């Protein structure tokens, strides 16, 4: 009667056959999309007349609608494109990072995070200007220089897959140059999302919490280790796992730049390395919840 069970462990063929029919689809999808990519996406962002040092100056000079604008925070830096938010809290916000859909891969090396990547904005169809922001990470160099022009406040917003929004304001925010590994630093916290950057994640007692503080942390990309998790094992690096370019510290309490998990809820047995990568803000929605919308914008604070 030991041959009524092995006969039964036939559900092994059943499964194994499903996993060979799946690999079928996945192989076809990857080929389809690969064709789709023989042709790129295009935008025609006709530049707005008005301009300034940053968005605060532009809202003041009459730039009332949120869209792509050209800025030159210095007579020695080539004017660059950027998306300005003129509506959220008195406007004048210079968008530094943005997540809304899953259009852009944020898992990049040190250089791309230096120069910037993604789409600043796209056309509002019918309109000949890009009033809609894309997903991007304005270079680290540009974000550093921008915060070192004088006092600068940082606004971090996010929304879950149901509609709820929460903020995180830091009345003080600076970012050193590349020689100082773009070290971050913030202060003066408000918002209703939880001071993750400063007090680590509010849901873990002891050393476990302090090790999740970004404030004062260097910047790291999977190809450049500057996190606060000392280990000679090349596979154990906050950026490698967790999947973003960020001020990791063994590792995080906040993880914008994380993987865009559609739907919101996701689990360890879904993550590449089994960690909580994904657009995450722990002090608000846990560790296994990737935000639908998550952004980072700045202003001079004047």
């Amino acid at each position: 009667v030991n041959s009524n069970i092995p006969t039964n462990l036939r559900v092994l063929r059943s499964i194994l056959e499903n996993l060979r029919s799946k690999i079928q689809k996945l192989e076809s999808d990857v080929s389809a999309q690969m064709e789709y990519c023989r042709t790129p996406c295009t935008v025609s962002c006709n530049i707005p007349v008005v301009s300034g040092k940053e968005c605060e100056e532009i809202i003041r000079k009459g730039g009332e609608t949120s869209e792509m604008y050209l800025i030159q925070p210095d007579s020695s830096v080539k004017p660059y494109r950027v998306y300005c938010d003129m509506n959220t809290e008195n406007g004048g916000w210079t968008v530094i990072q943005n997540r809304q859909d899953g259009s852009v891969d944020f898992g990049r090396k040190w250089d791309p995070y230096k120069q910037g990547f993604g789409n600043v904005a796209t056309n509002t169809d019918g309109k000949n200007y890009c009033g809609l922001p894309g997903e991007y990470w304005l270079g680290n160099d540009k974000i550093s220089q921008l915060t070192r022009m004088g006092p600068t406040e940082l606004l971090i917003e996010m929304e879950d897959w149901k509609g709820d929004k929460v903020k995180a304001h830091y009345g003080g925010f600076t970012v050193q140059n590349e020689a100082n590994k773009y070290q971050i630093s913030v202060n003066k916290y408000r918002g209703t999302a939880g001071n993750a950057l400063m007090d680590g994640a509010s849901q873990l007692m002891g050393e476990n919490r302090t090790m999740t503080i970004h404030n004062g942390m260097f910047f790291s990309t999977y190809d450049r280790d500057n996190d606060g998790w000392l280990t000679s094992d090349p596979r154990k690096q906050c950026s490698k796992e967790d999947g973003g370019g960020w001020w990791y510290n063994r590792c995080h309490a906040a993880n914008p730049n994380g993987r865009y998990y559609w739907g919101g809820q996701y689990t360890w047995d879904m993550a590449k390395h089994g960690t909580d990568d994904g657009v995450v803000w722990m002090n608000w929605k846990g560790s296994w919840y990737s935000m639908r919308k998550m952004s980072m914008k700045i202003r001079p604070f004047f």
């Binding site: 994640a201 873990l204 999740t212 998790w229 906050c238 063994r250």
Partner: peptide
């Protein structure tokens, strides 16, 4: 998150 954090790392044990």
């Amino acid at each position: 998150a954090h790392r044990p």
